[model samples]
Target: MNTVPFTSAPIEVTIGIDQYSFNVKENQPFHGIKDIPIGHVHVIHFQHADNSSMRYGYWFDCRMGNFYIQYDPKDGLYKMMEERDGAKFENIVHNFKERQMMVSYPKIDEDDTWYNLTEFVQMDKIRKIVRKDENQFSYVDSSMTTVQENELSDPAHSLNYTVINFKSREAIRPGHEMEDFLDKSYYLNTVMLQGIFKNSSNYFGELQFAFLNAMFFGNYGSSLQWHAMIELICSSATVPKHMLDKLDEILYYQIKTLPEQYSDILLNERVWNICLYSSFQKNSLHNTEKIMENKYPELL
Candidate 1:
């Protein structure tokens, strides 16, 4: 599909099940055409109303860029995109095409070829057809796996993928399915999905996403149930804990050595105060920084 921005009017999108909301940019292809780089490089500034701590992301076209490898809230679920994490792909590129878009680079895994996004939600397999809402957008990933590293500028090679879909109230008038919900009030948090793991297997599987105006990768981590449901991941449906642990020491050691700052800001502040949320939440009229500021505010 076309990865262009603003093929049409922009609207306020509430993602990850009302976890957070923001007015998505028409960050279209033509944006960078002038070499302005204004819209070419997009951002999702992370925010919070409680104590001081947060993160952000810089979106180069439609993928992730290297800068700060952050999982401020790194837990068993965080993952890096890597190669050999075998999986498949889709021409969904067709979905965003024509309006000036980003034709994502494809990933090759031996005979199987797939792709991955810099950020997105990881999910468990659909156990069954719970109920498909005709109007809702649904994405699915046939496989998933942990990657060897976080080299996301080349996300097509990153592993630890999952299938996900997104939908929201495109219209904002009364009687609109998502109106009352989008009313500017601040949300409680949980914008990022959390799932119960089976013996820590596929532990990184859960809904993920990006915040508004974030300028680097160090701030925001994975999960965007609303962005994609890539086909990359382990060929098998299940992956054991120890199965990935051999290569996971690298992933673990970093989490273990994180400085004392994380305990106060990121994990606690949560992913709430991004420009995305502040610009749209009913809190729009109030001072986002002053009112909900964290004491030990994070830098960079």
Candidate 2:
């Protein structure tokens, strides 16, 4: 019997939700990029008698340098939280069915003053397993589906995407033919998102370098069924417009200085996070019309 000791609904606590919270510490570096730690879902499998902490989640866009990890000192307990651009959250259950596999740990010891901190070490002992699987669950309604399950299912290649179909074709761009089709449906599921791992701490201002990288080359999963999950995930990580502005800034400066910068390097990575960066910039700046920004402001 697979049990879900704990789980939660799409827990969205954004800035606008509680604009009424007393404006204490008006200058509190609460802005995620400023210095405060960020938050995200946590996965802990423990003994009822003892409490323990656990971890993982998300695929940060490499070129864009959009996701991050930080410490939250709100409680004595220690756990991981993810900071994306300007947003942060914790205690998330990656999917729907796993919602009830919750257990508000710390069963309590003989004394109320001291509790048992049990450390779990095993495989089968854990219940309602919701780890970071490629087939990861989303906090979306079980009934809610954008792309057909089979499309995202990644069926046989010989029978799927038929990448060959586009072998001689260019992507359908916006403001032209494919542009009008850009609706809420374009930015949806994140199942294809990859690489949101922990790295050394960085000032938000300094990390735009990476964010731009992913923007230019991030694997947005499949063009099949107009997959948009990864884009949705990037949307949630609270980054602001300056993020957009800076991306271009760094891109141009980097190009201007290249004459004094390289030799054996041009033949390097992605023709140097340079070749793609410049081409990507030109493509994005001119081609993107942003028909609809902020499609789904809330979703896990």
Candidate 3:
């Protein structure tokens, strides 16, 4: 019952499958970042009038920052939709389910209408959830688990000493091993940020800074630090999108060839907005400012 009531029916239009409409007055608490990572499911539990409930899990994806929704293929609503238009949706569902989740790039249309969903929900209310407990959910599928375990077990991937720090200029130079790994890291993170900036009005300048900082320090950030950074980003409002995109590219090249350790920062928070005045803006020229500012306050 830790929920907030919708003042009005969020999705006023009929989606046509079960004649189901989310209750306008129901206190549906959209899970925020504060309840994630350290331990909370990035899920929404829908309570029906019959006292039964339906659970839908949501996560921000890595490739393009799209929000992915996961429900049991056996859920009643899913079954009904399958029964009605199974053939038409067969290809789409199958393609996404290949990733073991169904993803729809829901957009907030200019007319205030949503493309894939109804209008009641705010993008701010939805967030990416990663669980550390037994409650396995979306994005962290079976294959990913094996890879995580494999990476942890392999000594080749271990970093006995923090090589990349504020002082290492060679960490980003081409020929270095850290630089090569950083190339892979930069592309994937850019793809995700590009996806997010394109899909919604959210600006992730804070995340952009953290990514730059990690790259500056060689991606050695801890899980709690990344989580805390994301939580702080979520505890505010959005910034101008155009500036964020331009500034993001400016910083991307600075650490293009910089770490294996910062994906936790990249993938954790799917949705984040920039504050009115942020470190990214303060140090728009990242490399120069890191030296000029002399302390790198953004990372701290």
Candidate 4:
């Protein structure tokens, strides 16, 4: 493999990936270093070519200051290092110097612990695998296609489906508090569904049903309800005067009664302040003067 060399007084190094580069500071230790004049810190930054995903990472040197990065590649690097029988670390530093990247070691107590910093990535690799699987979902349609159906009807598929469905159904039933907690859950599910459905070209209807069922059971209330309300408004073209009047009345009642109903839970005045801010954003009330006049006349 090609390699880059570290700089003699290296301050920075960038490692190129197929799609992006990993930038590192030279003085940083892979693990925490203690009692050095500069202390230990590791900072990494990931810059993407297409800007689709960004990540960061930061670590403490224990000897010096906080190490911070926008994304973490430690696990992947560590795994690569382990598989290569510690050759990966040597390669990385070699690449750093070859690339004219500087290395900075903190003025700290040199100990054997620095050699063991390589073990932190097994857990990180597991997370990377999960992220990879999620990305795979983004490439295909989430709908139950003929292929999926065949797979599903297969004995192995049937068992997995039976198990997962049993759990899902048990978690969502009428009059359950879990139903109320569904809003945030559904919103997250919608994001995952969108990623899966946006690129699919087959079994669209089935996919929609599959996604809807998932969202329904998964607790996606905010996204589904918001979409429903938006669809209703758009289909009508114009808001009916009666509907508008009813909406205003409902809003008034909610404003008057909701706080009282949750008075104990919302005893903090800051909660009310956050609610006002949230309402403004949700309602798109942009004019500060209007907000001041209607919601906070005292502030004005």
lDDT of each: 0.24, 0.22, 0.28, 0.27
**Against the true structure, candidate 2 has what lDDT?**
0.22
Query: Candidate 4: which stretches are off by over 4 Å?
Result: 1-45, 49-83, 91-100, 103-170, 173-300
Candidate ranking under lDDT, highest first, comes to 3, 4, 1, 2
- lDDT (Cα, 0-100) at 300 in candidate 1: 12
- Number of clashes in every candidate structure? 60, 36, 4, 34
Better of 2 and 3 by lDDT: 3
Compared with the true structure, what per-residue lDDT tens digits does model 3 show for residues 64-160? 2212222232432211011234443344434434543221222223522111112111223222222232212222111112222333343332212
Candidate 4 lDDT score at position 115: 21
**Candidate with maximal TM-score:** 3
Root-mean-square deviation per candidate: 20.8, 20.6, 16.2, 18.8
RMSD of candidate 2 to the truth, in angstroms, is: 20.6
Each model's TM-score, in the order given? 0.21, 0.19, 0.22, 0.22
Q: Clash number for model 2?
A: 36
Model 1, TM vs. native: 0.21
Number of the predicted model whose lDDT against the real structure is largest: 3
